[PDB]
Amino acid sequence: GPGVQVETISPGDGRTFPKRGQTCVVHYTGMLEDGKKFDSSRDRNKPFKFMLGKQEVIRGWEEGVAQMSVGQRAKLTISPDYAYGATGHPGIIPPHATLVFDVELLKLE
Amino acid sequence: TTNVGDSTLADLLDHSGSGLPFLVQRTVARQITLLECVGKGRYGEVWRGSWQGENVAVKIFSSRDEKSWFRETELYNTVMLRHENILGFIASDMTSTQLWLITHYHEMGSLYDYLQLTTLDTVSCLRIVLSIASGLAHLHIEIFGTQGKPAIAHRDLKSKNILVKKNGQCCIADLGLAVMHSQSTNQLDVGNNPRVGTKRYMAPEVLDETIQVDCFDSYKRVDIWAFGLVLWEVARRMVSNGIVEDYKPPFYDVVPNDPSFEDMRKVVCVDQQRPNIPNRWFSDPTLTSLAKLMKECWYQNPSARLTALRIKKTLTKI
Numbered sequence: 001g002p003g004v005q006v007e008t009i010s011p012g013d014g015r016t017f018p019k020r021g022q023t024c025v026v027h028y029t030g031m032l033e034d035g036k037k038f039d040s041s042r043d044r045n046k047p048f049k050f051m052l053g054k055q056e057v058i059r060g061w062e063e064g065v066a067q068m069s070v071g072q073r074a075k076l077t078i079s080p081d082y083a084y085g086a087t088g089h090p091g092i093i094p095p096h097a098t099l100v101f102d103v104e105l106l107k108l109e
Numbered sequence: 110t111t112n113v114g115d116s117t118l119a120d121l122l123d124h125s126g127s128g129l130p131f132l133v134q135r136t137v138a139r140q141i142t143l144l145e146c147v148g149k150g151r152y153g154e155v156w157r158g159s160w161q162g163e164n165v166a167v168k169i170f171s172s173r174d175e176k177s178w179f180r181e182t183e184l185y186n187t188v189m190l191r192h193e194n195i196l197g198f199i200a201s202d203m204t205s206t207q208l209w210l211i212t213h214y215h216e217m218g219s220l221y222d223y224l225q226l227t228t229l230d231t232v233s234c235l236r237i238v239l240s241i242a243s244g245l246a247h248l249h250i251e252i253f254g255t256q257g258k259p260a261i262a263h264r265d266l267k268s269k270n271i272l273v274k275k276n277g278q279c280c281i282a283d284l285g286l287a288v289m290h291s292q293s294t295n296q297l298d299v300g301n302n303p304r305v306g307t308k309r310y311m312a313p314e315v316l317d318e319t320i321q322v323d324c325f326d327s328y329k330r331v332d333i334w335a336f337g338l339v340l341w342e343v344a345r346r347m348v349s350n351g352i353v354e355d356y357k358p359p360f361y362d363v364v365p366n367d368p369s370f371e372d373m374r375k376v377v378c379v380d381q382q383r384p385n386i387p388n389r390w391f392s393d394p395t396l397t398s399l400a401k402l403m404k405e406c407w408y409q410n411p412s413a414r415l416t417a418l419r420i421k422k423t424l425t426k427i
């Protein structure tokens with residue numbers, strides 16, 4: 001799909017893909033293109049949860065995680081229009097930043 | 110409605126900046142229920158909101174003040190600013206374009222409105238002015254180390270930007286005009302906000318435009334001038350010997366409501382006027398001491414003004 005490239009690190013079950021209204025429980029590490037880590041749920045030892053279709057996360061995450069199956073770990077490379085765009089997130093993400101996330105879909109609730 | 114694994118805001122803030130982890134800021138911002146508009150101003154509006162049964166303040170910026178949202182979000186995300194007398198940041202989110210800044214909620218409201226609803230005794234007056242001095246000294250002082258912070262000047266200190274906490278102490282809010290400085294690189298980060306300070310509280314050097322804009326120390330002296338004006342507003346409301354003054358903003362008697370830059374420049378620079386000290390303050394030891402402190406914030410020469418740390422120490426001895 002546009003805006004997000006999915007490179008698999010380890011496979012999921014290949015059959016249980018997130019549906020609209022389901023809660024995705026994931027572990028992630030986010031980095032800028034130069035490898036600078038800006039956020040990681042793995043460092044907090046606390047999985048991150050979001051409801052698919054609610055737009056609680058950037059578009060690249062909604063569309064990238066929807067292509068993953070339960071148990072899958074993948075590297076998502078998200079273009080700036082599918083992330084924080086021209087503004088970025090002041091003090092964390094610069095303008096027009098491509099973001100790289102190592103995401104593991106742990107389970108669906 | 111509670112699920113196993115759910116965290117409260119306190120747990121999410123315990124962990125990288127002043128607020129929630131980066132991705133968590135958007136998720137939490139987009140899960141808040143707005144409830145009641147508790148303030149409006151040049152900045153836009155502020156609302157009491159709720160997230161999982163917890164109150165938060167949601168500041169929704171006007172289209173005219175987008176650069177203050179950028180600057181305040183930048184500051185709280187790049188500096189770990191966690192102090193009892195500095196408004197706690199939780200999250201910033203962009204969602205027409207809406208710019209949100211979420212912070213702790215202080216149900217007592219601003220000091221400006223608080224001073225109009227009640228009089229103060231020696232206990233509540235000293236708690237207020239000491240807590241403002243403590244927050245201001247924490248902003249001004251640079252801390253070295255990985256648990257440190259650059260020195261920060263506010264540039265818009267005033268009673269409307271100070272919130273009263275449930276315990277009677279205050280916290281300083283609005284870092285949209287703040288400037289940062291670090292001794293290691295002598296780097297001054299002034300930002301790109303065209304906003305200027307509130308006219309009524311502008312120091313003489315800001316009004317006559319002689320302030321040295323590339324000197325961090327100059328911005329600390331502007332904050333000290335404005336602190337002295339806030340001290341005067343608070344002291345007026347402390348009862349002594351059955352007497353108390355009505356709430357008035359600084360320069361109430363010589364400038365109109367919404368004074369212009371020229372109204373202020375004529376009073377403060379041309380005529381070198383300062384707020385008047387009521388005669389009854391000299392009969393009370395606490396007010397006599399505060400009148401002495403106030404005057405030391407109001408010298409025309411900014412270099413003569415005392416530091417936030419010297420104010421805090423003086424207040425700790427009263």
Ligand SMILES: Nc1ncc(C2=CCC([C@@]34C[C@@H]3CN(C3CCOCC3)C4)=CC2)cc1C(=O)N[C@]12CC[C@](O)(CC1)CC2
Pocket residue numbers: 147148150152155166168196212213214215216217218219226269270271272282283
């Ligand atoms: N963080 C915050 N938390 C809470 C507020 C409230 C403000 C006002 C109120 C009251 C109107 C409702 C009733 N009530 C009375 C009831 C009787 O008993 C005495 C008080 C006070 C309630 C809450 C504001 C902010 C905030 O951020 N304010 C600002 C003001 C200016 C700035 O520049 C910097 C901080 C932007 C927003």
